[PDB]
């Protein structure tokens, strides 16, 4: 078929134009960089020349940015069976998230300046109810994965980066006064839907990539449709990153609250739930090692799936570390009596055998480096 491929000048004009539009948007429109999140948030955070009266109006009606957060907080608190998909919320959640981070020997002076600049950008949101909105949206999804919850988690991480104590206090206060069980029920459900390494899915992909499929209108060179092995790995990382940031800075009050919610009618132990996912991830990694144990060299697709599994395992270990540091005696006792020891025993078996296997060929040195820091 290569030697009989039709040249572009023999195609009809309308067909060639359609191909041009697809090529132009991918190479020229998508690649274009336009940063407007900082400018948009700055414009919405300004009160408009209403300071010529300075009376008892000190109630200080919300600024345009504040009204935007209240509107999304309004639809999150609406009594509905399912949180319907909203592109407007997703678009603005990304805008708010992208406006808060904005980020080889950095000195002490500017290191603090970056932290203070980071705090100010986060302050523009959590002082306008953004911290409460994130919790409401998580509780509204009721444990259903999707673009809505993923956008909410990214926004929550954006305002919690660096261990923002002020945001943590606002989130903790809101949960304790409402005494709602939906937030942790949603979190627990999301963690149970997180995927691990599936060998059956991996085996199917290897056969699929060996067929070499093409399309009708032209010919696609091994189309790269969505990965089906740990497809939501990025979602899993931010879900545990969000939980880690709730305890960042050794917030003992939030560390105890994750283990037990005293005011709620029912209690969910998030600390134990994290260990449950770690066991499932560890078992999947152990199964993956046995699959390649007979084989002499791990091929490229296997190494990539190993790398993303280790990245998720790093976040879970970091999240567990943040739960107990400070130290939090209650969380330490909870982990001691949990199945964490079984997971650690399993990881040691995988670590010992993978180190010996990976060291036998220099083509897998990068994977070995990632394995070592995971240990």
């Amino acid at each position: 078929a290569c030697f009989r491929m039709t040249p572009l000048y023999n195609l009809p004009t309308h067909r060639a134009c359609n191909m041009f539009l697809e090529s132009y948007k991918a190479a020229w429109i998508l690649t274009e960089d336009h940063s407007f999140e900082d400018r948009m948030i700055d414009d919405l955070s300004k009160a408009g020349e209403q300071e010529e009266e300075e009376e008892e109006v000190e109630e200080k009606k919300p600024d345009p940015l504040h009204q935007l957060v209240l509107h999304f907080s309004r639809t999150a608190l609406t009594e509905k069976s399912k949180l319907d998909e909203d592109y407007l919320y997703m678009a603005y959640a990304d805008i708010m998230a992208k406006s808060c981070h904005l980020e080889v020997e950095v000195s002490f002076e500017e290191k603090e300046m970056e932290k203070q600049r980071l705090l100010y950008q986060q302050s523009r949101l959590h002082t306008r109810g953004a911290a409460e909105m994130v919790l409401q949206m998580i509780s509204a999804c009721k444990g259903e994965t999707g673009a809505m919850v993923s956008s909410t988690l990214k926004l929550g991480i954006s305002i919690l980066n660096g261990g923002n104590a002020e945001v943590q206090q606002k989130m903790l206060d809101y949960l304790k006064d409402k005494k709602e069980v939906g937030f942790f029920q949603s979190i627990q459900a999301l963690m149970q839907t997180c995927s691990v390494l599936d060998l059956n899915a991996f085996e199917r992909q290897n056969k699929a990539e060996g067929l070499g499929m093409v399309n009708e209108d032209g010919t696609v060179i091994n189309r790269q449709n969505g990965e089906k092995v740990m497809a939501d790995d990025e979602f899993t990382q931010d879900l545990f990153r969000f939980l880690q940031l709730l305890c960042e800075g050794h917030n003992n009050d939030f560390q105890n609250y994750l283990r037990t919610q005293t005011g709620n009618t029912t209690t969910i132990n998030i600390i134990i739930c994290t260990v449950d996912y770690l066991l499932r991830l560890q078992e999947s990694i152990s199964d993956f090692y046995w699959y390649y144990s007979g084989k002499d060299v791990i091929e490229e697709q296997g190494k990539r799936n190993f790398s993303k599994a280790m990245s998720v395992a790093k976040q879970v270990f970091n999240s567990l570390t943040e739960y107990i540091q400070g130290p939090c005696t209650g969380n330490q006792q909870s982990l001691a009596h949990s199945r964490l020891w079984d997971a650690v025993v399993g990881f040691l078996h995988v670590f010992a055998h993978m180190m010996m296997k990976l060291a036998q060929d220099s083509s897998q040195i990068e994977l070995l480096k990632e394995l070592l820091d995971l240990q």
Partner: protein, 820 residues
Amino acid sequence: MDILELSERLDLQRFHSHTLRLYRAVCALGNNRVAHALCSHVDQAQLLHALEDAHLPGPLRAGYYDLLISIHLESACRSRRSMLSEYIVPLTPETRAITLFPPGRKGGNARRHGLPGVGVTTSLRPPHHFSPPCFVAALPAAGVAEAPARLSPAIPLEALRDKALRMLGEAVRDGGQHARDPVGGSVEFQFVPVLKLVSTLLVMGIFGDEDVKQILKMIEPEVFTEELEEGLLQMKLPESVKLQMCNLLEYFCDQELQHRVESLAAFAERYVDKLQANQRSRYALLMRAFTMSAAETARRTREFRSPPQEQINMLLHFKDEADEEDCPLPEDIRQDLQDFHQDLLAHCGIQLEKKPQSLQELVSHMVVRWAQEDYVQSPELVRAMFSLLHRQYDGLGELLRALPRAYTISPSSVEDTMSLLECLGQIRSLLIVQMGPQEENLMIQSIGNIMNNKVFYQHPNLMRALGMHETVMEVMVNVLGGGETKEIRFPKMVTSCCRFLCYFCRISRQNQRSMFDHLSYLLENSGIGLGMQGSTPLDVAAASVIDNNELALALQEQDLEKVVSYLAGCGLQSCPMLLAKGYPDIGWNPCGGERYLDFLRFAVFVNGESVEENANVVVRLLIRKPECFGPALRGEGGSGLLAAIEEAIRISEDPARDGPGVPPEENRVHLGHAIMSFYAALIDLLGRCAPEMHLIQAGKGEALRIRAILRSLVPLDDLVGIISLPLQIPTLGKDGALVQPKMSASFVPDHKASMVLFLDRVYGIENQDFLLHVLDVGFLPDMRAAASLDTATFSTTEMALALNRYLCLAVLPLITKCAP
């Protein structure tokens, strides 16, 4: 009494206002037949008089404005609004002249923005259709649900648009005067009814270029000048009026987006011609390269040995200035794209003063000013203004998300595309109405017209962009959703939609993949699809994975588990529909189970080979629920496969046990034939789940285990016994009439064909003595029977044709393999 007396008679005012609400309700959502009836009660003169009546009470003024829209404009506006999200741009000379900026001398990178909604737009939009309201025409002789669908009542649009412009202009001046008696009793009642009418007419495209300019002057006389008159944006209106102002600005923002898409399509037509002309010239000179070059000619001709999509990807790869070596375009051609890329970003306000000077700056300033002037209390207004604000800040992203719905077509295919859009508009109108006998006929003929259109097959990508398969699927499931267990009504509509989707999948793999994304959605609605016969949602699911290894390997286990759970249910309960028809109660549903069996047949067998990933899962799922094998193969207390078939034959020969015993019903179900068909389907499925020979020869442990399980389920002697069963042969007698079996109520060669497939794939013929044993009891009697039927009378009989298919697909190919 004068209707103006209702300003003090509040009891009658409320009742009459709700009467107008009832008028809108009965004609709501495309009920054009009732809309014509309402014209006999509220005629055109009354409606036009009510619009200009300044003494009408607010509820009545708002009611009559909404009544006019509902009767005459609601159907046309809704249909037009659905088409506004797509951009089908024909490559006509009018399209070629479209440019991002008007011809001017302001700046090379970007001139001044033109007035939004003013200019030439070539995107295809089907025209509005109206019928004159007449009550003296002869009533059609056509019966109900068969006459053509009624159109909306006709009202003079040119006169209506002039009145709407004049009334809006007067309101702006009147609003400036700050009169203590605004029309309708409040500022809200004076502007909202008028703005709704203007917004509706703008969407319908009634206003011309001059009319749009007048509207822009009223909105903002300073920004929208081309080269007390206060604009609406500065009149300090309440929140209800502000919501209508957002709708107006939303239309003009859409026109700017549409202009960018058409301009981009216009540039594509011009740029492709230069690309094609240059590539033709480059190829011409490249044919003489051997005189001054060598083996690296393959690198230069690499472009011509690549798919056309990849060819144009390489040609446009000169943006980052680090890829100016692989791109073979001359610098002059490269400059044209870069010049257009600069003025496209400028037209989106990327980069390149209290006056906004543009729609983008006007809307952004207005939304921010509104929010910081007061705490907005209307959630609808808050969403409207922030949705509008987001578009202005992200114009390139808005264009990026609209390109997937943009499509360029040849000017010679415009008329067929317009016809297809008309049919699609009819189908989309059925998403907001409960299905009925009249809507069923409209849905069926719309599907038939679409499938009769060449564009539907020439441009599968365009059909996918229009969401045609989604719209048809949503209509089907709404009918299936109602009455999901007791009775399915409008069966002809369901089988028309299902047949449409099956042909939709076979057009291209991309269409097949698109329907594969709804595989779980189809399966959950396929539980009751067994009741309907013909094309069913289960058939659509099967058609979305047939002969496609990529989709077969992507089939999730949950979908297979869902089907096996359905199959398990059919093996434990009788069909409720059959029981209600007087059928004898056997403790299972062979008819329903067979339909699920053939779906699994397509999931595990693709292109003549068994998909081991799906085959292993299906076998393991089946054995975990042994009731999927039927009352036979039950283990304890269960007769063998051979005994079940023999029992089914006796059932078929005996009435009062094979049917109701009251085709008679034109699709009469025979339990004897149904039982054989189930086991034949089950044996066929298990045979196709057998591992391929190369896996068995390789000694794979999983393959050997699966074959051992299959052998345990179906003993070899039962296979030979079924093949050895006699077949009824069309004979002659009783004056010479042909005594033929009824193929729908008897043992047929197709049942034997499934057994042969299992024997070949699972057991095989490895020794000569076994081969001879199979021939003289199972194969040779059938071969002789077919040979004897090759006479003048019996050659064309149904049984003879079935025997030929059985021999030429199962028996003879097997004997050819066993020839040595």
